[PDB]
């Protein structure tokens, strides 16, 4: 299990784990508590399974949407920051970590999907999605592609799904309405249909994932990709002269991604709870703290009032937030777990030719 006197932290493999361990050893050199940062695969699914047997990490990092399902089964400890440390973060971000009147996690930064485009190849990016099958043929006279991005994860295909009026659950009368699911409306049916057409007209490939989408933009094989601020560091290195701008509109409506806040939650079963709140409150959510993380892999719009101002100048954060402002923030209801599973199966089945669009979404609504 986990010993006391040690913090075991889990954070997803695309974030800046190396810089978080840097902060961990800062914690070591003056409290004596060893900190181990690990980035296990499918982190978000292993945690409910190992925590209910007793153990796993102390601290888990993820978007805020899965922390609802966690707190509902009581895997998370209720956090008690005083109203003066709450003021060090935007009074915005504390809503995304509040499940059932209680606070269950610390907000670290706000993530949002943006359009990343090769400035050396596509100086004026497309304002709409409509013009990409036409932009593609113009870049098939070079051998280039037009656009590539993770189709394995519905997180990335949803800004086009929810574009023309698609949605997860209807937020009506204080609650998210669990039985009102908008994965069949005219908009989602027309959003995924346009995604399908791009594949069978061979402007993308249904088999593309994260590891060939970024692995094609960093070598200049593709003009555009859709990714979050964590990919900037790898792109910064490759010295591909790129820009970060607002997503293309789809049939007038702007692309509406789902927004998550990177949040740190504390295992309810940890013997090291106060140690874990010292690390987060005193060391991580600080200037010298987040700067360590942000330099490994950028976090987006950080929730710390303080360090946000210093990154303001960044035209890349603006595109992140300007694109978050279109489309709403992720519900955290326990059903998000089964929501994403229902959507990646309807996207995959329709990207692949197994069911058409109408057939793929009608399945997903049967909960």
């Amino acid at each position, epitope marked *: 299990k986990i010993e006391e006197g040690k913090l075991v932290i889990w954070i997803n493999g695309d974030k800046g784990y190396n810089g978080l361990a840097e902060v961990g050893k800062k914690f070591e050199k003056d409290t004596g508590i060893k900190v181990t940062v690990e980035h296990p695969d499918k982190l978000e699914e292993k945690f409910p399974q190992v925590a209910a047997t007793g153990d796993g990490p102390d601290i888990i990092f993820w978007a805020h949407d899965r922390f609802g399902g966690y707190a509902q089964s009581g895997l998370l400890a209720e956090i008690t920051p005083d109203k003066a440390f709450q003021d060090k973060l*935007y*009074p*915005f971000t504390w*809503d*995304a970590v509040r499940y059932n009147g209680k606070l269950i996690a610390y907000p670290i930064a706000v993530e949002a999907l943006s359009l990343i485009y090769n400035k050396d190849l596509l100086p004026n990016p497309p304002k709409t999605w409509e013009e990409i099958p036409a932009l593609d043929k113009e870049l098939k006279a070079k051998g280039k592609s037009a656009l590539m991005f993770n189709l394995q994860e519905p997180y990335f295909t949803w800004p086009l799904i929810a574009a023309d009026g698609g949605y997860a659950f*209807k*937020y*009506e*009368n*204080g609650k998210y309405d669990i039985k009102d699911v908008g994965v069949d409306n005219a908009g989602a049916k027309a959003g995924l249909t346009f995604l399908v057409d791009l594949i069978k007209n061979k402007h993308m490939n249904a088999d593309t994932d994260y590891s060939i989408a970024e692995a094609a933009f960093n070598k200049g094989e593709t003009a555009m990709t859709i990714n979050g601020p964590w990919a900037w560091s790898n792109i910064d290195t490759s010295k591909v002269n790129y820009g970060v701008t607002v997503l293309p509109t789809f049939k007038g409506q702007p692309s509406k991604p789902f927004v998550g806040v990177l949040s740190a939650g504390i295992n309810a079963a940890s013997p090291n709870k106060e140690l874990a709140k010292e690390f987060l409150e005193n060391y991580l959510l600080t200037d010298e703290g987040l700067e360590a993380v942000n330099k490994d892999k950028p976090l987006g*719009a950080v929730a710390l*009032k*303080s360090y*946000e*101002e210093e990154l*303001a100048k960044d035209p890349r954060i*603006a595109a992140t*937030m*300007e694109n978050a*402002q*279109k489309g*709403e*923030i992720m*519900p955290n209801i326990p059903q998000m777990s089964a929501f994403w599973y229902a959507v990646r199966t309807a996207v995959i089945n329709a990207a692949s030719g197994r069911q058409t669009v109408d057939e793929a979404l009608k399945d997903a609504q049967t909960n």
Partner: antibody
Amino acid sequence: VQLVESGGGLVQPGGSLRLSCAASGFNFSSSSIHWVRQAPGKGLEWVASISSSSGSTSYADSVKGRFTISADTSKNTAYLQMNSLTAEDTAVYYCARYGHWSWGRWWNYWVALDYWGQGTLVTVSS
Amino acid sequence: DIQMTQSPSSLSASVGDRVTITCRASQSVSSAVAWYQQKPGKAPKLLIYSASSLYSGVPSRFSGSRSGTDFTLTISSLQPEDFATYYCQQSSSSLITFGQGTKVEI
């Protein structure tokens, strides 16, 4: 696209008044509706807000407990009920849609009241 | 609370001139500011949202910019219909707050 207010006028101190804001031209069920008042003399003051879907309500401390915002999604109208009015409530009241982030939480962080109603005058004198 | 301070209270720069209106939030807010124009006797129209982005339909000469906690409305040229009052608004945390207003005179 427009927002038509109604219900302004003359009210004795302590009295009540209900302003209405009739909306059409946008998806009203996915927008927030805000009331911003302007004294004959001073700047714009934000009074109360509501998300037409979550029913969520917030108020400025200067009206807390006296004012009650609401909305009817089927009739596309939002109303601001204003009880126990003081003379320093005399102002033109504007009604403005937010739209965007609302229909989750964050429904009242970060607004851009793009569209406004023509405003309506409320005068509290005896 | 949040106090939006505009500069100046009233300016007086001519047709064609480059007007710059600065508005400084007391507490730290993100790029959350908006800029409205209010001709006398009509509801405010919106110009800038999120501190730098031009709202739909709004002319080219208008622009927004952010340097930490002060926010700058700049009109590059100035046409004769600009002579009205200009409000900045912060919503980082609802209680929503406006500026005292800058008046642009002919």
